[PDB]
Structures are given as C-alpha cells and as structure tokens.
Write an enzyme that holds these catalytic residues in place. Structure first.
Site, short mmCIF file in Angstrom:
data_model
loop_
_atom_site.label_atom_id
_atom_site.label_comp_id
_atom_site.label_asym_id
_atom_site.label_seq_id
_atom_site.Cartn_x
_atom_site.Cartn_y
_atom_site.Cartn_z
N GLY A 1 0.84 -1.18 0.00
CA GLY A 1 0.00 0.00 0.00
C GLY A 1 0.88 1.23 0.00
O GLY A 1 2.10 1.14 0.15
N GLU B 1 4.32 -0.29 -3.78
CA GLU B 1 4.13 0.93 -4.55
C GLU B 1 5.36 1.85 -4.46
O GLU B 1 5.39 2.74 -3.60
CB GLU B 1 2.86 1.67 -4.07
CG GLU B 1 1.59 0.82 -4.24
CD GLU B 1 0.31 1.49 -3.74
OE1 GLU B 1 0.36 2.63 -3.23
OE2 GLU B 1 -0.77 0.86 -3.84
#
Lengths: 5, 365
Positions: free
Chosen positions: B77, B119
């Site tokens: 995330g 990410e």
C-alpha cells in the site's frame, strides 16, 4: 494515496 | 471470469453507516476477496491493525457461506512505503525469510493466497535494481508455493500483484513478461490516472484519451494501460481490469470553468465519511444535490461539479461500459477498489446494495 495508493 | 474485490482493514473506523466490517461483505458478490493491507516486520509478514487476527478469521470465515470463494492477503500500500520491500529483496536470505513467513501466515489464518502491493519497485524511493529483484521475489514465491503444495498436498497458494497503469511506473519497475508467467493473476490498477496532485482537473479513471490529448498524456487511460500490459506479455486471462468505486476531487480555480482540464487549486473538500481530501467514495457523490453531472464523451466516464468542487468518478453506466470493454479484449475479469467505498449498505444512492460492484457481477455473468 487516498485509495489503493 | 473473476471478480476480485478489495477489503480494507481501516474502514472499520469510519463513522455511522460508513463503518465497514467483514459482516458487511456479501459472501456471493465476488469470486476473490483481497484483504488490504498486511505489513512487514524484520522481513516477515505481519498485521497492521490491532484486531487483524480476529478480522482475518471473520474474513476467511465467509468461505463457510460460499465455499467457492477464494481469499488473499495483500501486503503493501502507499503508506507502507518501499524501504522494507527494498531491504527484504536485497538478499536471498531475506527473501527466504519473507517467503517462509508468508506461507506460515497464510496457512495459519486460512488465506488462499498472497497479493503484492508494493508501490512501487523502481519508484517512490526504490532503486533501479528493485525492478529485477521484484522479478526474483515473484519467482521465489512461485517456487516456494509450488513446493509447499507438493510437499503438503494442499491446494497451491495463489500469487497476484496490484500493478500500476502508468507507463513511467511500469517501465521503471516491472519485467512484465517474466513476472506474468509466475503470477496467477494481475490486478491492474486502471485508475488514479489523474488526481489533485495535478494542477488541472482530470478523470480518475477514463476509458480512452480525450481527442485533444497527445504524447504521454494520451496514455493516461484504461485502454492504453490494458494495451500496455498485454503488449508487454501479460496473458489476457491473467489481466484483471481494476475498477474504482470512488472518484478524485479538485477545488476549481474558478466556478466559471468546470471543464475537464480546467485549472485547479488543489484537492476537493474531504468527504464527510472518508475524510481524505482529493477523493470521495461513490456513496458520497451519487446523491449530490444542486450539482451538475456531465459525461466526458471521449472517455466514457462522468464528472460532477458544484460551486468550486469538481469530481471525476465512475457510475453504473461507466462500469457497464468497462466490462463490455474487458469482455471484448478477452480479459480475465474485473477487480475493484474497494468494497467499503461502494454504497455497500445501500444507504445513500437509492440503487440497492453494492450498486457498482453488483453491476460488475451482473455484467460479467
């Protein structure tokens, strides 16, 4: 950012 | 076809009717449920919320109602950053520590697989070598999962990854052809194409480019992202098209210019329930009063504005259009972020329970 990112 | 749905473990803290817990999930709505997000401690998979162990049990307990349902745990995330991934993939020893901790964790809590949400390798601080080390990590996991299924006789753990649509991110961190062979499916994040980090309004998830767009700008759309992942080697059946049940907002430089591409001064006002400037859940936009909704002809998606607020989002019609698109391209199904952003309890939109995701289910079927 704000959701998935 | 697959319908992959993301659950978020922080939605449980939303107020009133926006609060979302495993009990609020429709067991028969999706084919795959992915739990966001797990973290990492000393190169080992770990929980991120105080009650995750209990939520894990309720989440995987949904399979008692629908035995065909498959669940996966997502690690990463945005807030997780990249440093822990970079350090973990740096050495074979660290990767083994992670891989073995992942198998144990997933088997312990009854998850059917792991979803990687870094990410991103090669970006956000992650160095260039992480593009190939990400490939090694995926190979290490595929190898380990295959081996464990063989030694234990249990169904092989699934491995997927949430990947970016933007060419810049894809080129900097993903050896698409290589990793695609080792992933059971690829969750294409075909959204977040535009956001309040930009100085002009733009749609969160346009299907095609605007006629007047050119260059790099002309690739910030779903069609370009899909074409990219297919062209680089992703088997169509493994490419799962992401769909957003939220929109991205902007505050306009002037209420006199509400066009796509109009000057913006920053994020739009935070939503009453989501409280995150720059985005709004579908249930926070679907019933806007005194607003003006318009469809972007070329992009096949809507936006809505009121005074100095502008929001690009997806509705039932755009979701229908996108499923027709994915079926035409022969993709493996749809993916959605996220369960708690759709009008799950049907309390705001007058469209029943899960209006957007139910649309995906009906259209796919």
């Amino acid at each position: 950012r704000x959701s998935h990112x | 076809a697959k319908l992959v749905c993301y659950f978020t473990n922080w939605a449980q803290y939303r107020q009133g009717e926006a609060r979302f817990l495993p009990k609020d999930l429709d067991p028969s709505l999706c084919t795959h449920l992915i739990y966001a997000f797990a973290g990492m401690t000393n190169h080992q998979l770990s929980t991120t919320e105080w009650n995750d162990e209990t939520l894990y049990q309720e989440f995987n307990g949904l399979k008692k109602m629908n035995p065909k349902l498959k669940t996966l745990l997502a690690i990463g995330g945005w807030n997780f950053g990249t440093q822990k991934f970079t350090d973990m993939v740096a050495t074979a020893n660290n990767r083994q520590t992670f891989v073995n901790s992942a198998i144990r964790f997933l088997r312990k809590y009854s998850f059917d697989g792991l979803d990687l949400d870094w990410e991103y390798p090669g970006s956000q601080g992650s160095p260039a070598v992480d593009k190939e080390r990400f490939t090694t990590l995926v190979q290490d996991l595929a190898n380990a999962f295959q081996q464990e299924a063989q030694t234990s006789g249990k169904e092989r753990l699934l491995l997927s990854a949430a990947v970016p649509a933007g060419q810049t991110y894809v080129d900097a961190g993903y050896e698409v052809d290589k990793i695609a062979q080792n992933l059971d499916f690829v969750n294409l994040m075909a959204y977040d194409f535009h956001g309040s980090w930009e100085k002009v309004t733009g749609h969160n998830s346009p299907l095609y480019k605007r006629q007047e767009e050119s260059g790099a700008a002309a690739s910030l759309n779903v069609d370009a992202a899909v074409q990219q992942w297919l062209q680089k080697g992703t088997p169509a059946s493994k490419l799962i098209l992401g769909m957003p049940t939220y929109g991205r907002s902007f505050t306009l430089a002037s209420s006199s210019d509400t066009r796509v591409g109009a000057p913006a001064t920053g994020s739009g006002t935070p939503g009453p329930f989501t409280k995150e400037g720059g985005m709004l859940a579908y249930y926070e936009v679907c019933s806007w009063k005194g607003a003006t909704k318009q469809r972007i002809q070329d992009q096949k998606v809507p936006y809505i504005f009121r005074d100095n607020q502008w929001v690009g989002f997806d509705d039932v019609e755009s979701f229908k259009t996108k499923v027709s698109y994915l079926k035409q391209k022969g993709l493996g199904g749809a993916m959605v972020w996220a369960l708690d952003l759709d009008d799950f309890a049907g309390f705001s939109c007058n469209q029943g329970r899960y209006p957007l995701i139910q649309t995906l289910r009906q259209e796919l079927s």
